[PDB]
């Protein structure tokens, strides 16, 4: 009965901008991760620190599912030890990340003829994100000596740009949906178990 709701994460009708990435907490269910890896409908399934074929007889204190939108060229950026716009200012993994990064093309889904402009990313920040940090602030970025007063202008940027997802885009400028399963084990009960134990 109480299977974990990976459906409502992976098959959500609308996703989320990468700067405002979405986290689902998984709890008091049993995870059938075989549904994941026996799918024929991902382009990338990169697991660090864990073997997804070997965690349906294992239990974790909590599992987190992070969901968002980026672009082809940027998928290789969700991954320990990476740098770039997305790893630095948007979504950061730790160097000892334990979990999976799952990704698929979503052009049929996340492009319009006019150009999708509802997916945003962050373009500047005053410092790098810490792992599993989320900044949603829309303060003007001060790139020069002179201080802006919440005003856009010279050496003063609004800190989100849109992606320009048009269906005719090049192969790696199209959008990909991404899910990041991460796993914790504490000195506290487990609640997320494979169907085997």
């Amino acid at each position, epitope marked *: 009965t109480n299977l974990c709701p990976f459906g409502e994460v992976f098959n959500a009708t609308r996703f989320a901008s990468v700067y405002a990435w979405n986290r689902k907490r998984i709890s008091n269910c049993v995870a059938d991760y075989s549904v994941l*890896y026996n799918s024929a409908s991902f382009s990338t399934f990169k697991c660090y620190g864990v073997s*997804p074929t*070997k965690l349906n007889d294992l239990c974790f204190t909590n599992v987190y599912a992070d969901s968002f939108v980026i672009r082809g060229d940027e998928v290789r950026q969700i991954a320990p030890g990476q740098t770039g716009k997305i790893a630095d200012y948007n979504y950061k993994l730790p160097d000892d990340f334990t979990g999976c990064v799952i990704a698929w093309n979503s052009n049929n889904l996340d492009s319009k003829v006019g150009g999708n402009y509802n997916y945003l990313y962050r373009l500047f920040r005053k410092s790098n994100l810490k792992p599993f940090e989320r900044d949603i602030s829309t303060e003007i970025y001060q790139a020069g000596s002179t201080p802006c007063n919440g005003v856009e202008g010279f050496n003063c940027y609004f800190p989100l740009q849109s992606y320009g997802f048009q269906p005719t885009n090049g192969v790696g400028y199209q959008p990909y949906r991404v899910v990041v399963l991460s796993f914790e084990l504490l*000195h506290a009960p487990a609640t997320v178990c494979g169907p085997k134990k």
Partner: antibody, heavy 119, light 114 residues
Framework: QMQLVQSGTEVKKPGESLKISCKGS????????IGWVRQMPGKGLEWMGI????????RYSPSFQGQVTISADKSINTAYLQWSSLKASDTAIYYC????????????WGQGTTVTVAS | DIQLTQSPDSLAVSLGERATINCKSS????????????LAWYQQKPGQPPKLLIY???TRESGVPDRFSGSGSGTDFTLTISSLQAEDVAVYYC?????????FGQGTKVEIKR
């Protein structure tokens, strides 16, 4: 679940180039990284490098950096390992080995391919 | 870059008795996120591909008898074959899979004593 079938045995001459293959048979291959291990006659196991076929990310061991090339072709769940110039000292068995995940155990192997360089 | 020394290099033990092999790593292999050491044990016999026997230090792979067990933390690890049997003669390697490059120990040979 996964089985790894490896290419047959090879007798080459020193100088010649060589590509050997290891093809993953099974669902879930998207999640698999494939590693290459050398065993020289009578000796222990050396890890050579590893590749993720999904995007062809490649690590090597400092002993094998430069000396071999680990490619992959993700449309046929195959990993490759190749020299451009074989020396006598490349005589060995080569095992490919897989695990779903990186920094996870290598929990499936091929039955090895033996390379002879020499007449 | 992580280096492993096994010992002993050779080990003779009587049928039914307990073999212990030690593995030292030059650095820790503990991940904090899940409290677990990133160390495995393989066995190999002539003409055969390594078999995995134990991972996360102390967990048993399928198809492995209950007489195989692993322990240890930080930098000291142990493989223990209790009630050694005939078919348990073989070479045993400890591998670390904490980061690449992955590394094996130099190998411990195990014989029966008669």
């Amino acid at each position: 679940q996964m089985q790894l079938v490896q290419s047959g045995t090879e007798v080459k001459k020193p100088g010649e180039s060589l590509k050997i293959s290891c093809k993953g048979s099974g669902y879930g291959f998207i999640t698999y990284w494939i590693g290459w291990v050398r065993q020289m006659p009578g000796k222990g196991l050396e890890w050579m490098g590893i590749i993720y076929p999904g995007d062809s990310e490649t690590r090597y061991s400092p002993s094998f950096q430069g000396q071999v090339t680990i490619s992959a072709d993700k449309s046929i769940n195959t990993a490759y390992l190749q020299w451009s110039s074989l020396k006598a000292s490349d005589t060995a068995i080569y095992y490919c080995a897989g695990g779903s995940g990186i920094s996870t155990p290598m929990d499936v192997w091929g039955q090895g391919t033996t390379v002879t360089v020499a007449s | 870059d992580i280096q492993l020394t096994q010992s002993p290099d050779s080990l003779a033990v009587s049928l039914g008795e307990r073999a212990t092999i030690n593995c030292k790593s030059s650095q820790s292999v503990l991940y904090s996120s899940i409290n677990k050491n990133y160390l495995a044990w393989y066995q190999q016999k002539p003409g055969q591909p390594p078999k995995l026997l134990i991972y996360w230090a102390s967990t048993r792979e399928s198809g492995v008898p209950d007489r195989f067990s692993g322990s240890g933390s930080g930098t000291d690890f142990t493989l223990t074959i209790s009630s050694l049997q005939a078919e348990d003669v073989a070479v045993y390697y400890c591998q670390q899979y904490y980061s690449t490059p992955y590394t094996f120990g130099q190998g411990t040979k195990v014989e029966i004593k008669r």
